[PDB]
Design a protein around this ligand. Structure first.
Ligand code: DGD
Ligand code: DGD
Ligand code: CLA
Ligand code: CLA
Ligand code: CLA
Ligand code: CLA
Ligand code: CLA
Ligand code: LHG
Ligand code: WVN
Ligand code: WVN
Ligand code: WVN
Ligand code: CL
Ligand code: CL
Ligand code: FE2
Ligand code: MN
Ligand code: MN
Lengths: 61, 64, 32, 434, 35, 341, 37, 327, 32, 45
């Protein structure tokens, strides 16, 4: 029950790092945000979902 | 520039490191090691007393 | 080229500077 | 372009000055800085809970945010002992996660958001000279601040309560049932002298006064916010102030400078909003605790050149105050204005009563006095009170400097000579000499 | 001592009021670039 | 041309670093002094001269590392490496404090060389030599403090050691044994230094706040160009401001800059006179009338008497470790204290 | 001490509070990237 | 002109006065004059003050056996602490003089006066149409004075810890501060020392470079200062010549070609240094003392090998025992 | 210490994340 | 307490003097044009 939570929040850290690197680059770059606008939405939704799941699993630990 | 300085500079840094790690600095400059500040016979602070016999006095003090 | 005032002064500063930096870095890892 | 000295007149080291006349980027910069502040709060809370050693007190571990959370009543039991650090972890997590949202908002409103707001969002745009709109924004944020103060009040009275050092037998988490809503007490606190023995607003010594004053502050801020939303500055106010972004910045700078000085004095002197079980004893508290411990060790046993009433007029470590009251003697005489929970039961109408110290003393008071004697901000360890006081005093001074700089430049720019003397119509050449 | 206190209070109040109402008298307009 | 003319032409060539004839004295002496100071603060100990560890090899940091003065057993010896004290032995020469003499002598000659460099560059450029006369201030400071004071004292031991904490120790030692704050020449030096700092700050602020609007940019550093025949700031506005704010103001730029030159130089020379007076223990330590008043009146106390007591405390509680050669042994009963005074 | 599940993430948390300083440095780096225009 | 109050405002903010008054001067002049006359009267004829509060007064007045150097206005009694102590809060005038009340009077009126001086410098800068940041420069000595007169007594809890208004009293304050806090090892006092030394060096250097490159506008029979005329539009010295001399004295890159940047640096350096040393005094008022390198070197056996910091600590201890008249 | 290595690795990644954005913007030639 | 006012008579200078000056200031304030200007500062005086 603890290893699952550790893996989940590690995935959350990795996704937060990826979003921090990508989102300003995607938005500022004139080439991006047209062919890859939905990628930002999917990444942010996955980030919030990971936050919610970590909050859920924190309860059982 | 970088071709010569990629060999001379690290070798010089390692030489400076070994000047201390091998204990040559203590021998050259007379700096006492942490285990030889006070001898068994002399537990006090060693001080030179005469200017014209300073070399012999330091030889006597640093002999042990 | 091989010998210049600027070159000699720079090396007179640098060859001891790097030697002393190595010595101090070694001093940092002494048991003390 | 608007992002270079050629098109703006501002160099890179003054580059944020290019944000004065663009609203969207300015809003983004402010939201990004807010995200930075929330990120620091969350990260430092996580850092402090990660380094918290249960046996040591909070003030012996160099912690400054955990005492703030403990004063609010979270994770603290009777006597100031810390039960669990999980609510502190939750606070840190919530701040550090909201920081991501605030940082995204700042980045969006700074980089890809519109440079100006009035052409696309007229409800948010401004000119720095439309007094009605600036007063409306001021009123909205005033309502926000008043609601924050009322949120603190609700925490004090409804959700868990606040830690009180003045509870009997040591501090405890108590619900503030009846705060002081009487305007006379609050006005007297605001109008009190700031010197020794009075202390102005720093000397508030009970939680009821704190909660009542925060009730008054919250409702007053809500009323003033609605006022500034529904009104325009009067003729006396319009002709007295400079109406530009830099002038408002200077006003905020002097306000926060005064607030920083007040907070430094609060951390140094106040032991009610800054409990000594979390922040450690104050300097006067430590000195008086050392004197009291010596007095106790003289009353018990009595071999420390004090066995009877022969020494002095009163007992040892006792003298009379400048107003005649009985106080602790010695070098601690300057700290006779200290009021601490472990010494209040031993003080009577005339001051410290020797027989009451002899008989009505409690072991927890002795333990508090000894542990405060061990850790002295002045001396007998760097106190967290010392860190807070020094840091915020320095911040208050440098922000007074910033206020002076920005106010002078706002005046010069409004008048129109902040770039230098015109050299064509020089003002001093028209004035007659002498 | 009360008479000294009332004199000091009178003087301080007078000077502070003069300062306050002087800086309220459109002080920004008192610049050489004002037209 | 001759060999001397060709050497003069080569030494005067416009290179990145000007050499000149004065360089032949400046560069080797200054380089050796700086290198010897680094060597002493890095490797050389003070254990056999002061009973102290002052080197990075012994564990000291930047503040506590110093090139300590020679042992008091040496008099005012030049401490030549080949001299009778060392007799060519580098290790014994470093142990007896000869590196301090090396640094001090080569540094004094480096200061002389730098002053000659200022003279030579002023002559070649074609300007008045008001540098190397300003530098006479620092030269006098160094000569009085590091050379004349130990020469007047017992030995080089009482000179300042070349270190941060060593300099702080020298300050407190001089205060304790001479009451140098009470010295009027030191007071004139303090006035000169503080007035020079005041002049620097006030002149910078006055010039920055009286500039002409010579540019359309808010940042006004671009509005100036070196090839200007016009003044970049209003002297009349500054004079009016300081005449109606302070009551007096500069009206001549040349007099203002000469005054900004003169104040620190005069302060340094007065302080040098005071230190020369200290060199022979000819100190303004005490006021005889105040001492007589305090002797016949135990209830008479001024801050001067408290300063005298403080200086007595520094002398007694530091003599034992600051002068280990004297073998001072003071019992706790003889040590002055505020309690039982 | 952190909770049991979050103990292994102590190092990154220890790096966390000094992040804003880097932000300041990052700004300078950005001004270095554009040539301080 | 329009009204009586308008005429009063015009006279107050008039540039035709010999000394500008202004609204800040309306507060500055009474406070400064009061503090000045009280300081003169106290320095001449004040009774001795029981500064330590243990009924042993300390004399600091000329009529009680002091000279100019040893004379001072003794700080307030330690029994007073930082309590507000005006004349009307004392039982008698003798009691007020005995407890160091004039020190509090002078300190408070002088701090109000220097704040008014900052504001008045800004006010006359605004009246003359010049830039207003001379007052920002003047904040640094004001900050230092407030730190040594107000902030340190607040942190310590007694005005008796403030700097005495004298010369020997100032020296005593410095020595006691060094003993208590080791200010010499404090990095902010080191920054202040660097600031004042750099200010002296830069003032001397700027004066030397301007005087060295003075353009010949005068004859040998008169002073060179007459080569400059007040109000002249041309520059009195050659910036290019001084820049070339400075760039040849050191390497070429180290030079201030821009005169405005050079003067900005001249203003900035000592002001920043004094700001840092005032901040250091403020921090040490709340016991944020300097670096402690005592007993930093030990041998293998564990015996402490002394450094220069140990000698400094010995001197500080020698001062400390003398300052504390109690155990 | 393994925790020291973890701290150094996390610090390196955080310090890389900053200039990485600027480098990517320069590669994509955006508004830098 | 309050503004150091331990005697009621001390309230007489603290109110009458600020009011009286204000009355003088009123003669200034009524003279000035009190309309909006939409500027950094009001040059009308
Ligand atoms: C304006 C005038 C400025 C000087 C007035 C005095 C400033 C001062 O002594 O402030 C101290 C007061 C607090 O006063 C203390 O307040 C204390 C309150 O504690 C009391 O109440 C507490 C309640 O927990 C405890 O019970 C405690 O035991 C009990 O003693 C005591 O009364 C002390 O005697 C009393 O001295 O802070 C305050 O009122 C808030 C005011 C902060 C002023 C900050 C300093 C002024 C600015 C300097 C700027 C310098 C740099 C710029 C230069 C240009
Ligand atoms: C600015 C322009 C200059 C720019 C900077 C220049 C820097 C370079 C030069 C700096 C160093 C110069 C050499 C100094 C060496 C010295 O001084 O060496 C000192 C020697 C004397 O040595 C001392 O002599 C003393 C007296 O001894 C005599 O008396 C004793 C009594 O017991 C014994 O009898 C003993 O045998 C007997 O010799 C003590 O013995 C001391 O221990 C011993 O050190 O003089 C001598 O060599 C020669 C003495 C002749 C005078 C020459 C120097 C004059 C300078 C001022 C000297 C101090 C005066 C007071 C200043 C305040
Ligand atoms: C916290 C302080 C702070 C803040 C909020 C800002 C904010 C801003 N500055 Mg200022 N600035 C600052 C400090 C700050 N600056 C300092 C210290 C300096 C001196 C070096 C400057 C010098 C300066 C100049 C000279 C200029 C600005 C400008 C700007 C604006 C746009 C910058 C731009 O084009 O980005 C371009 C930068 C990039 C493309 C690279 C950075 C990419 C992002 C922002 C990195 C963020 C990392 C973060 C982890 C991402 C989170 C993602 C999220 C989903 C979680 C913006 C409003 C400009 C402006 O708008 O003027 C009109 C301008 O001309 N600033
Ligand atoms: C407190 C500061 C602040 C201010 C004044 C604004 C103001 C604005 N934002 Mg920004 N924003 C902020 C913080 C702020 N935002 C933060 C913290 C985030 C991160 C979540 C965002 C993310 C954001 C986005 C993504 C967008 C805006 C947009 C807008 C505009 C319309 C918003 C609206 O109608 O309200 C909505 C009111 C509600 C009650 C909705 C409830 C939620 C307006 C100019 C929009 C725009 O186009 O303007 C640039 C837009 O697309 N904002
Ligand atoms: C951050 C909050 C904030 C801000 C920036 C403003 C800003 C403004 N207000 Mg608003 N206001 C606020 C909160 C705020 N107000 C609140 C909470 C209320 C409810 C009480 C009001 C009620 C209000 C009214 C009724 C009026 C203003 C007016 C004004 C304008 C001129 C104010 C002025 O000259 O001060 C003048 C300040 C004083 C005369 C000083 C009074 C100080 C009192 C006596 C307390 C003293 C405490 C202490 C002893 C001294 C200070 C100590 C310090 C260290 C704390 C200005 C636009 C005026 C205007 O033109 O708008 C229409 C106006 O008529 N405000
Ligand atoms: C909320 C507070 C606030 C705000 C919004 C502003 C906003 C502004 N100020 Mg003001 N200022 C303030 C407080 C504030 N200031 C204070 C408190 C001071 C006193 C110190 C000043 C002193 C000041 C001056 C003297 C000037 C401004 C200027 C400016 C403008 C441009 C700023 C800029 O580009 O920064 C650029 C940012 C930098 C160059 C970075 C500076 C970094 C500092 C020196 C390091 C300090 C230590 C650091 C915090 C520790 C981190 C360690 C790290 C280095 C490893 C802008 C309008 C300038 C201007 O254009 O006027 C309109 C100007 O000349 N301000
Ligand atoms: C500008 C060059 C310069 C100058 C002015 C000095 C000056 C000095 N040095 Mg330094 N030195 C220099 C270059 C210089 N040195 C260089 C390049 C080296 C490296 C080899 C050294 C290495 C060195 C050491 C190791 C020591 C000195 C010492 C000294 C001092 C004693 C000199 C003495 O009596 O020697 C006597 C010799 C001469 C003066 C040579 C003169 C030759 C004559 C004029 C020619 C005629 C000879 C005759 C016909 C036969 C003196 C202050 C000593 C000292 O005081 O340290 C404490 C010392 O120990 N120097
Ligand atoms: C120490 C002394 C402290 C004095 C504090 C002064 C605060 C500002 C007083 C200016 C007061 C002043 O004299 O200005 C009065 C100002 C101008 O007055 P007039 O002479 O033009 O009269 C117009 C009428 O509406 C009466 O005001 O009137 C207005 O701006 C609109 C009404 C606001 C009335 C004032 C409400 C807020 C007053 C706050 C008190
Ligand atoms: C605008 C501007 C222009 C140029 C200049 C400029 C200054 C460079 C720039 C500014 C840009 C700025 C200032 C941008 C602002 C950027 C900011 C403040 C970004 C905040 C990021 C925080 C994150 C991703 C934290 C998430 C926390 C988590 C996942 C918590 C997790 C936890 C869980 C769940 C459980 C426990 C474990 C952990 C892991 C601790
Ligand atoms: C991090 C940090 C913080 C703040 C900023 C900072 C200061 C820039 C930085 C510091 C960085 C640091 C640590 C910088 C340190 C740099 C260092 C240590 C430079 C050392 C140079 C040594 C020299 C020149 C010695 C030459 C020896 C000679 C000439 C020998 C002479 C000989 C002697 C003994 C005498 C006999 C004759 C001979 C034989 C000739
Ligand atoms: C002298 C010098 C040289 C050149 C000129 C110069 C530029 C002026 C200067 C530069 C000097 C220097 C030293 C410049 C150095 C500049 C550097 C290295 C700046 C680094 C910035 C990194 C940031 C802002 C990281 C943000 C990461 C976040 C928010 C994510 C965090 C986290 C991750 C892992 C994921 C979620 C969990 C959390 C914890 C939230
Ligand atoms: Cl005691
Ligand atoms: Cl003393
Ligand atoms: Fe100049
Ligand atoms: Mn003290
Ligand atoms: Mn003491």
């Amino acid at each position: 029950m603890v290893a699952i939570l550790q893996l989940l929040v590690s995935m959350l850290i990795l996704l937060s790092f990826a979003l921090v690197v990508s989102v300003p680059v995607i938005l500022v770059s004139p080439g991006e945000w047209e062919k890859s606008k939905g990628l930002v939405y999917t990444g942010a939704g996955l980030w919030f979902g990971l936050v919610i799941m970590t909050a859920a699993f924190n309860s059982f630990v | 520039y970088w071709i010569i300085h990629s060999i001379t500079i690290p070798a010089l840094f390692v030489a400076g490191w070994l000047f201390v790690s091998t204990g040559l600095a203590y021998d050259i400059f007379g700096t006492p090691r942490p285990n030889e500040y006070f001898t068994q016979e002399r537990q006090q602070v060693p001080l030179v007393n005469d200017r014209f016999s300073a070399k012999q006095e330091l030889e006597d003090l640093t002999k042990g | 080229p091989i010998f210049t005032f600027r070159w000699l002064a720079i090396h007179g500063l640098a060859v001891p500077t790097v030697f002393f930096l190595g010595a101090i870095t070694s001093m940092q890892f002494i048991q003390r | 372009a608007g992002r270079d000295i050629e098109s703006t007149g501002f160099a890179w080291w003054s580059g944020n000055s290019r944000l004065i006349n663009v609203s969207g980027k300015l809003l983004g910069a402010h939201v990004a800085h807010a995200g930075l502040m929330v990120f620091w709060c969350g990260a430092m809370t996580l850092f402090e809970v990660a380094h918290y050693i249960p046996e040591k007190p909070l003030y012996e571990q160099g912690l400054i945010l955990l005492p703030h959370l403990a004063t609010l009543g979270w994770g603290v039991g009777p006597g100031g002992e810390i039960v669990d650090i999980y609510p502190y972890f939750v606070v840190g997590i919530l701040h550090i996660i909201s920081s991501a949202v605030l940082g995204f908002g700042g980045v969006y409103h700074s980089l890809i958001g519109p440079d100006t707001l009035e052409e696309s969002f007229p409800a948010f745009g401004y000119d720095w000279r439309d007094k009605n709109k600036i007063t409306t924004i001021l009123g909205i944020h005033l309502v926000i601040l008043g609601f924050g103060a009322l949120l603190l009040v609700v925490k004090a009275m409804y959700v868990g309560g606040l830690y009180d050092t003045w509870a009997p037998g040591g501090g405890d988490v108590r619900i503030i049932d009846n705060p002081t809503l009487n305007p006379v007490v609050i006005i007297g606190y605001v109008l009190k002298s700031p010197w020794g023995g009075d202390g102005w607003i720093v000397s508030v010594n009970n939680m009821e006064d704190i909660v009542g004053g925060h009730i008054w502050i919250g409702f007053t801020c809500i009323a003033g916010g609605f006022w500034h939303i529904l009104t325009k500055p009067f003729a006396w106010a319009r002709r007295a102030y400079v109406w530009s972004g830099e002038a408002y910045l200077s006003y905020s700078l002097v306000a926060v400078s005064l607030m920083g000085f007040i907070a430094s004095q609060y951390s140094w002197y106040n032991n009610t909003a800054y409990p000594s079980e979390f922040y450690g004893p104050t300097g006067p508290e430590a000195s008086q605790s050392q004197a009291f411990t010596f007095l106790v060790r003289d009353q018990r046993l009595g071999a420390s050149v004090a066995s009877a009433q022969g020494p002095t007029g009163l007992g040892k470590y006792l003298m009379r105050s400048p107003s005649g009251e009985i106080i602790l003697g010695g070098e601690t005489q300057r700290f006779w204005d200290l009021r601490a929970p472990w010494i209040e039961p031993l003080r009577g109408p005339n001051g410290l009563d020797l027989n009451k110290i002899k008989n009505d003393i409690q072991p927890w008071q002795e333990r508090r006095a000894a542990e405060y004697m061990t850790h002295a901000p002045l001396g007998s360890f760097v106190s967290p009170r010392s860190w807070l006081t020094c840091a915020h005093f320095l911040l208050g001074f440098v922000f007074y400097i910033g206020h002076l700089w920005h106010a002078g430049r706002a005046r010069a720019a409004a008048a129109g000579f902040e770039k230098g003397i015109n050299r064509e119509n020089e003002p001093t050449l028209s004035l007659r000499p002498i | 001592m009360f008479t000294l206190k009332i004199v000091v209070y009178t003087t301080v109040t007078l000077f502070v009021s003069l300062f306050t109402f002087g800086f309220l008298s459109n002080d920004a307009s008192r610049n050489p670039n004002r037209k | 041309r001759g060999w001397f003319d060709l050497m003069d032409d080569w030494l005067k060539r416009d290179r990145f670093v000007f050499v000149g004839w004065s360089g032949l004295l400046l560069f080797p002496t200054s380089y050796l002094s700086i290198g010897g100071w680094f060597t002493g603060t890095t490797f050389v100990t003070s254990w056999y001269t002061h009973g102290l560890a002052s080197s990075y090899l012994e564990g000291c940091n930047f503040f506590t590392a110093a090139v300590s003065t020679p042992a008091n057993s040496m008099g005012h010896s030049l401490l030549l490496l080949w001299g009778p004290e060392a007799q060519g032995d580098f290790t014994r020469w470093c142990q007896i404090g000869g590196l301090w003499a090396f640094c001090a002598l080569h540094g004094s000659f480096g200061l002389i060389g730098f002053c000659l460099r200022q003279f030579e560059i002023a002559r070649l450029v074609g300007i008045r030599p008001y540098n190397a006369i300003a530098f006479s201030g620092p030269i006098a400071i160094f000569v009085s403090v590091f050379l004349m004071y130990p020469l007047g004292q017992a030995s080089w031991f009482f000179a300042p050691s070349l270190g941060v904490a060593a300099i702080f120790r020298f300050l407190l030692f001089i205060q304790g044994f001479h009451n140098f704050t009470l010295n009027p020449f030191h007071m004139m030096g303090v006035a000169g230094i503080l007035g020079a700092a005041l002049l620097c700050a006030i002149h910078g602020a006055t010039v920055q706040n009286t500039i002409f609007e010579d540019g359309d940019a808010a940042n006004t550093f671009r509005a100036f160009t070196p090839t200007q025949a016009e003044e970049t700031y209003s002297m009349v506005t500054a004079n009016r401001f300081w005449s109606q704010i302070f009551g007096v103001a500069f009206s001549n730029k040349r007099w203002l800059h000469f005054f900004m030159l003169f104040v620190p130089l005069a302060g340094l020379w007065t302080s040098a006179i005071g230190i020369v007076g200290l060199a022979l223990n000819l100190r303004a330590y005490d006021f005889v009338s105040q001492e007589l008043r305090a002797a016949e009146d135990p209830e008479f106390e001024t801050f001067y008497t408290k300063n005298i007591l403080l200086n007595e405390g520094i002398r007694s509680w530091m003599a034992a470790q600051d002068q280990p050669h004297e073998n001072f042994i003071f019992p706790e009963e003889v040590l002055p204290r505020g309690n039982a005074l | 001490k952190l909770p049991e599940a979050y103990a292994v993430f102590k190092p990154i948390i220890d790096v966390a509070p000094v992040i804003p300083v880097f932000f300041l440095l990052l700004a300078f780096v950005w001004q270095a990237a554009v040539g301080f225009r | 002109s329009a009204s009586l109050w308008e005429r009063f405002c015009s006279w107050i903010t008039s540039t035709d006065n010999r000394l500008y008054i202004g609204w800040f001067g309306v507060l500055m002049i009474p406070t400064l004059l009061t503090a000045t006359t009280v300081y003169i009267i106290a320095f001449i004829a004040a009774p001795p003050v029981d500064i330590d509060g243990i009924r042993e007064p300390v004399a600091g007045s000329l009529l009680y056996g002091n000279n100019i150097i040893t004379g001072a206005v003794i700080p307030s009694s330690a029994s007073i602490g930082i309590h507000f102590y005006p004349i009307w809060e004392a039982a008698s005038l003798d009691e007020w003089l005995y407890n160091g009340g004039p020190y509090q009077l002078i300190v408070d009126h002088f701090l109000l006066g220097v704040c008014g001086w900052i504001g008045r410098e800004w006010e006359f800068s605004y009246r003359l149409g010049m830039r207003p940041w001379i007052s920002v420069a003047f904040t640094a000595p004001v900050a230092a004075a407030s730190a040594v007169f107000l902030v340190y007594p607040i942190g310590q809890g007694s005005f008796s810890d403030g700097m005495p208004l004298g010369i020997s009293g100032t020296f005593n304050f410095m020595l006691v501060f060094q003993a208590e806090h080791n200010i010499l090892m404090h990095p902010f006092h080191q920054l202040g020392v660097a600031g004042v030394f750099g200010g002296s060096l830069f003032s001397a250097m700027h004066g030397s470079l301007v005087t060295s490159s003075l353009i010949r506008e005068t004859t040998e029979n008169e002073s060179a200062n007459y080569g400059y005329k007040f109000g002249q539009e041309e520059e009195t010295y050659n910036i290019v010549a001084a820049h070339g001399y400075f760039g040849r004295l050191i390497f070429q890159y180290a030079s201030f070609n821009n005169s405005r940047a050079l003067h900005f640096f001249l203003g900035l350096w000592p002001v920043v240094g004094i700001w840092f040393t005032a901040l250091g005094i403020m921090t040490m008022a709340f016991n944020l003392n300097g670096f402690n390198f005592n007993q930093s070197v030990v041998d293998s056996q564990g015996r402490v090998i002394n450094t220069w910091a140990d000698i400094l600590n010995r001197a500080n201890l020698g001062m400390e025992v003398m300052h504390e008249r109690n155990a | 210490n393994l925790q020291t290595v973890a701290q150094l690795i996390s610090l390196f990644l955080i310090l890389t994340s900053g200039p990485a954005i600027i480098v990517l913007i320069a590669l994509r030639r955006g508004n830098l | 307490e309050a503004l150091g006012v331990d005697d009621g008579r001390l309230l007489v200078p603290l109110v009458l003097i600020p009011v009286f000056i204000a009355i003088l200031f009123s003669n200034f304030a009524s003279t000035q044009d009190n309309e909006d200007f939409f500027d950094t500062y009001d040059q009308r005086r």
